[PDB]
Symmetry: D2
Subunit: 116 residues, 4 copies
Amino acid sequence: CPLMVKVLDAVRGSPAINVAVHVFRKAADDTWEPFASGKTSESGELHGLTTEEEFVEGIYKVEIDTKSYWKALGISPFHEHAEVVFTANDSGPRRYTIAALLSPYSYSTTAVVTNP
Amino acid sequence: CPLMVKVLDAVRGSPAINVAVHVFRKAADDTWEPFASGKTSESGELHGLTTEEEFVEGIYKVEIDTKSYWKALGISPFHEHAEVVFTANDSGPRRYTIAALLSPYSYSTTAVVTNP
Amino acid sequence: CPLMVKVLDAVRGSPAINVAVHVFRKAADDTWEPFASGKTSESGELHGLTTEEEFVEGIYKVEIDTKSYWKALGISPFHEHAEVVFTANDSGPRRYTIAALLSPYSYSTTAVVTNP
Amino acid sequence: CPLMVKVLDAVRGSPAINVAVHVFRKAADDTWEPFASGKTSESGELHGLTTEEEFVEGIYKVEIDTKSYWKALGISPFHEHAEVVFTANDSGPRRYTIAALLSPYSYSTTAVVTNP
Ligand SMILES: Cc1c(Cl)cccc1Nc1ncccc1C(=O)O
Ligand SMILES: Cc1c(Cl)cccc1Nc1ncccc1C(=O)O
Ligand code: NA
Ligand code: NA
């Protein structure tokens, strides 16, 4: 699998567990079409979203449902969700990790792109 | 000025100047309607986007055009843009500062919310 | 004011008020000598730490007393403090803003450096 | 091993490879005594720094030698190093991951503390 998502909690110092993640691919008419989805594991990670054959070049959006995560902890958050929008490019390294670090009023996101 | 956007560059240690910003508001049919737009000044700040009268309750999306910023400086970055999606004014009028700190493969965003 | 410190709270979406800050400068025997100190105001900012005359070339350490900040709000955080260590004025006088964004188990820090 | 260090590069979107890391423990006279050290691997990770028997409660400092990392890439950085100072506590979960995300003029750090 060429795409993994990892989510961390900056308030508790822990993985962010059971967070819903939705991935979309941009269609030719500029709409966002559902591509893959899941929930983070006990390690904060979501594996197996796609395959090499399916993950062709194009623009993708990863939506992390942060508002529901904070509400289940009893904490009032700012954002509706965190959105990560990027182009997949076959020239570059082949494995994409999209990571996010969550606080109630802030988030940080980075990409780690590597070649096995 | 109940909505201000501030952008910093983590590579240069400077304000991020001339960054385009587009704000949208979710309409009653669930589409994103254009609401306001502008670009950051020499201080990295974008003022004057809206007014207390026009900035009603709603779900707003602040799109910060990070790719165009980096490409103008000769850098091929990861993200298409940074998107900040939040509900505003649901407990009455507030003042919002949306800030972002930019790197080629990462960004952080936070909100400062005050009650005038 | 060639040195300013700004601190934000990522849990509340607000300035971090009443945060103690201690600045040190490395001496010719390699020890950290006390240089200046203060606390952040209602805006999260600490002004007036030093002057253009006293802020000579050197290696400086800005210690932001994050643990004491969180403990006063009822939160047991991870870090003792946040430390920012940098060489200043090695190409002539500059103005430095040291900013930090705080969560219980995380912090981000960045510098804005300008030439007056 | 109860302590792991992980370092990421926000400019290149990659692990930060071959970064020197030094760990110190605070002594009774308030000085910092060398405890363990190493260099990050090709995955940006440094394993095997200590053992359960040796990693007793106390105050520790993790110094990440970011300045040398950026200089070897040809990039002028701001900080001398990144410093992470924290108390180890036997009550909490048993495995500490200290992670840092590096840019030339900024860094973010978080702790992930979990129980096997
Ligand atoms: C310091 C910082 C980090 Cl580390 C990350 C994101 C924004 C900021 N800065 C701000 N964020 C919100 C409002 C104001 C600022 C500022 O730096 O003036
Ligand atoms: C340490 C950190 C910060 Cl400070 C901010 C955002 C992500 C991370 N962590 C990661 N980011 C990307 C890929 C992996 C990780 C990780 O911590 O395993
Ligand atoms: Na309401
Ligand atoms: Na010089």
